[PDB]
Amino acid sequence: VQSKIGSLDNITH
Amino acid sequence: VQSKIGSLDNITH
Amino acid sequence: VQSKIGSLDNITH
Amino acid sequence: VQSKIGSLDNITH
Amino acid sequence: VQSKIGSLDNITH
Amino acid sequence: VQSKIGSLDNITH
Amino acid sequence: VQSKIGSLDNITH
Amino acid sequence: VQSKIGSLDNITH
Amino acid sequence: VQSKIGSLDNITH
Amino acid sequence: VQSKIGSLDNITH
Amino acid sequence: VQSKIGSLDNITH
Amino acid sequence: VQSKIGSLDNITH
Amino acid sequence: VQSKIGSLDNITH
Amino acid sequence: VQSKIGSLDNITH
Amino acid sequence: VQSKIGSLDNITH
Amino acid sequence: VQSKIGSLDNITH
Amino acid sequence: VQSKIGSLDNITH
Amino acid sequence: VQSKIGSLDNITH
Amino acid sequence: VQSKIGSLDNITH
Amino acid sequence: VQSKIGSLDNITH
Amino acid sequence: VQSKIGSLDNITH
Amino acid sequence: VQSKIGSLDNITH
Amino acid sequence: VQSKIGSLDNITH
Amino acid sequence: VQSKIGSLDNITH
């Protein structure tokens, strides 16, 4: 509700 | 509800 | 409801 | 489910 | 569930 | 569940 | 979503 | 979401 | 979310 | 019962 | 019962 | 019962 | 399941 | 389950 | 479960 | 929900 | 929810 | 919730 | 209910 | 209910 | 309920 | 519901 | 519910 | 609920 997700997994290999 | 998802998985190999 | 999805998986190999 | 979601309700008497 | 989520309610008498 | 979440309620008499 | 309400009831008596 | 309400009830008596 | 309310009830008597 | 009701599932292999 | 109700699941393998 | 109700699960292997 | 009802109402008038 | 009812109401009038 | 009811109400009038 | 599941009702009026 | 599940009701009026 | 689960009710009026 | 089991497995080796 | 089990497994080795 | 178990496992070795 | 009610189960290895 | 009610279980290894 | 009610269990190794 009225929320936001920028990212969950940023995986740099 | 009135929410936003920018990204979930950003995987750079 | 009144929501938006920009992206889910951005996979650069 | 059986809710009121993302709505506007105006009443005048 | 059986809630009022993200709504506006205005009443005038 | 059976709550009032993220809402605005205005009443005038 | 990205909308506007100018007014709902304009009443002159 | 990114919206505006100018007014709902404009009443003149 | 990133919204504005100018007013809800403007009443002149 | 044993469902997926209004949910989001993302699986990356 | 044994469901996924309004949830988010992200699985990266 | 034995559900996932409005939750977020992130699993990275 | 594997049960028996002899009688429910015996009404002598 | 594996139960028995002899009678519920015996009413002599 | 494996139980018995002989009677509930015996009413002599 | 609001049901009668495997029950017994006896009503003498 | 608001049910009768495996119960017995006897009502003599 | 607000149920009768495996109970016995006898009411003589 | 009013039944009988003589045997299930008679194994001779 | 009013039953009998003579035997289940008779094993001779 | 009013039952009998003669035996379950008769094992001869 | 999802039960084993008034049943017999025999397993031999 | 999710129970083992009035049942017999025999296992032999 | 999730119980073992009025049952017999026999295990032999």
Author numbering:
A (entry chain E), B (entry chain M), C (entry chain U), D (entry chain X), E (entry chain P), F (entry chain H), ...: 350 to 362
Copy the relevant paper text.
Functional tau is most abundant in neuronal axons where it binds to microtubules, assists microtubule assembly, and is essential for the structural integrity of neurons and for axonal transport. Here, we identify a new amyloidogenic segment, PAM4 (Polymorphic AMyloid segment in repeat 4), encompassing residues 350–362 of R4, and show that it self-assembles into amyloid fibrils. Cryo-EM revealed that PAM4 fibrils are highly polymorphic, and, remarkably, that the polymorphs formed by this segment in isolation recapitulate the conformations that PAM4 adopts in polymorphs from different human tauopathies. In all cases, the folds share a C-terminal β-strand (residues 358–362) but differ in the way they orientate the N-terminus about an intermediary GS-bend (residues 355–356).
